[PDB]
């Protein structure tokens, strides 16, 4: 079938020193970010909630730097499956920023990123 | 509420109220950035490599508050569709934040945004 495609350009908070103010005034850089950031920032936040896509599947695009990848969204699982650029960080549950290639975010960011795998976790922010 | 999204297709909320880390160490906040924090050479030249997606289309989709936008993407103009929630921001080349829904990502992001509109060119933050 046809992949969804991601938003072609990156947010410039993944800029390694870039400072997220989180729903519970706390201030972090964004390597230093921590699974319980986004749990805890999502928990005090009204308008935010934390949802999860697990990563079923990562397959070459036809396209060089860019990845198609299947996710398995929120608790009903729903299939999805999107093109992204290979640099794009994803924050996996206990395990920090991670990318399917980590040396490309280095480069661009210098955001230390672990290799993006089957079964990860990806956290997002979505509004209630 | 809105059909099922992969991690990078959601608007990254938790950005309002960021402070960004530019290449040359300046720090700016997320509402403060301009088109020139995004150039690093201090005299632009007809050398100069942008990556940069152009918005060619924007429509409505059947589903509420999403938007699809059709882009040129890169040096070679790749045609990408792209679903996203209204307020989604971009960072459009002489101009700053824009989005399909200017008010709602004011709102949600707390900064000032203009309207997206075909003809306008997307960037990305980056060392590159
Ligand atoms: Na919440």
Same mark, same amino acid.
């Given at each position: ?18 400072? =997220? @103010?989180? /729903?519970? &005034? +706390? ?41 198609? =990848? @299947?996710? /398995?969204? &929120? +608790? ?53």
């Amino acid at each position: 079938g046809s992949p969804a495609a991601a938003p072609p350009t990156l947010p410039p908070y993944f800029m390694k020193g870039s400072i =997220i @103010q989180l /729903a519970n &005034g +706390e201030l972090k850089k964004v390597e230093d970010l921590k699974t319980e950031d986004f749990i805890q920032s999502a928990e005090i936040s009204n308008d935010l909630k934390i949802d999860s896509s697990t990563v079923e599947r990562i397959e070459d695009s036809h396209s060089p730097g860019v990845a198609v =990848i @299947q996710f /398995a969204v &929120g +608790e009903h699982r729903a299939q999805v499956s999107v093109e992204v650029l290979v640099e794009y960080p994803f924050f996996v549950f206990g395990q920090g920023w991670s990318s399917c290639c980590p040396e490309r975010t280095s480069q661009l960011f210098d955001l230390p990123c672990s290799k993006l795998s089957v079964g990860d976790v990806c956290i997002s922010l979505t509004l209630k």
